């Protein structure tokens, strides 16, 4: 059992979703998300006559304001019985210390913990901006469908009508489809991040390959983001006007591993779409009596006396991240 302050990572490397589209964090002192409580977009046009001023403007009463945040509280043991991750030859005598082994093993345990919540949050993000629906579900828990409201024109499919696979691999240009799906996106699209084989049949067209610019032509901080997360986001290059990226991230589930992304999917939208990170109550007596009922995360190291007389690291959170405008992204399944 070590203090709360032993929670230093400086490792925030989420794959460009919770850090770039979903910056809009709202931890609450209350259980649910109350979209009426969030101001979101403000009623933002009307003025008043040059004699007096008008009424009082409020948070404009969101129609649906009741969903259950994913209160996730996992834990692990940091029992000093293992040989640990030994960074090359930094004096294993301190590993021989139970104190250093226990502290850096709580380091390792907790980092596994937040990357676990981060990967489940990224699955929530990919569900969110791929269908507008999120499955708040788990065993011994009712499945609540949390819908931002993704429209039908945001779910139009490439296989409908003519498929890119069922097209000329040399002369056909899918740019026409690119603006066709981008027009009904309530904004400009500046990233065309694909799943791998989706980008494969996208680039199979020649027009794509002599239309794209392999050069840097550094447009924004997206190159810096790729250099940071050189793991699963791949900056293919410029398609001229728009940036071409491929995400091949993978989640390692209970017995097997598989990619986050489905077979062939796309979301057309902006890099500055508004993403909410509403956070529920944290059900920990420590959190309430020290005021961490409204926060992002909560770690603790703590000893059980009695039957499971041991010591554990416990991580608690409650995210219900969504997208403010589901119509911002057009979600297309590809050929």
């Amino acid at each position: 059992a070590q203090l709360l302050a032993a929670n230093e990572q400086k490792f925030k490397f989420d794959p460009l979703f919770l850090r770039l589209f979903f910056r809009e964090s709202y931890p609450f002192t209350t259980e649910k998300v109350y979209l009426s409580q969030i101001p979101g977009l403000v009623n933002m046009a009307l003025y008043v006559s040059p004699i007096v001023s008008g009424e009082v403007i409020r948070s404009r009463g969101g129609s649906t304001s009741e969903f259950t945040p994913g209160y996730v509280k996992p834990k692990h043991e940091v029992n000093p019985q293992m040989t640990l991750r030994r960074l090359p030859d930094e004096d294993p005598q301190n590993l021989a210390d139970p104190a250093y082994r226990r502290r850096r093993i709580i380091m390792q345990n907790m980092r596994d913990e937040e990357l676990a919540i981060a990967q489940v949050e990224e699955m929530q993000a990919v569900s969110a901006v791929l269908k507008g629906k999120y499955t708040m579900t788990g065993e011994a828990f009712d499945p609540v469908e949390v819908d931002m409201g993704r429209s039908e024109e945001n779910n139009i499919t490439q296989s409908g009508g003519t498929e890119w696979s069922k097209r000329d691999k040399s002369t056909y240009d899918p740019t026409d489809d690119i603006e066709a799906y981008a027009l009904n996106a309530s904004g400009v699209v500046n990233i065309i991040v694909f799943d791998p084989k989706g980008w494969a049949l996208f680039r199979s067209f020649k027009a794509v390959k002599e239309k794209l610019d392999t050069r840097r032509g550094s447009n924004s901080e997206l190159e810096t983001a790729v250099k940071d997360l050189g793991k699963a986001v791949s900056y293919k290059g410029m398609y001229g006007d728009v940036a071409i990226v491929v995400y091949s991230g993978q989640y390692v589930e209970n017995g097997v591993k598989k990619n986050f992304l489905p077979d062939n999917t796309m979301v057309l939208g902006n890099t500055q779409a508004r993403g909410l990170r509403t956070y529920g109550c944290i059900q920990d007596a420590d959190a309430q009596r020290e005021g961490i009922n409204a926060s992002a995360r909560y770690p603790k190291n703590w000893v059980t006396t009695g039957d499971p007389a041991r010591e554990f690291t416990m991580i608690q959170s409650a995210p219900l991240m969504l997208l403010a405008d589901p119509d911002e992204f057009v979600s297309v399944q590809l050929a």
């Binding site: 000093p80 005598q93 301190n94 210390d97 139970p98 104190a99 250093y100």
Partner: peptide
């Protein structure tokens, strides 16, 4: 018993 109390091997200031 040396587990719950651990001296590093260094100058006293940087060891305390």
């Amino acid at each position: 018993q040396l587990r719950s109390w651990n001296p590093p091997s260094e100058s006293v200031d940087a060891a305390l």
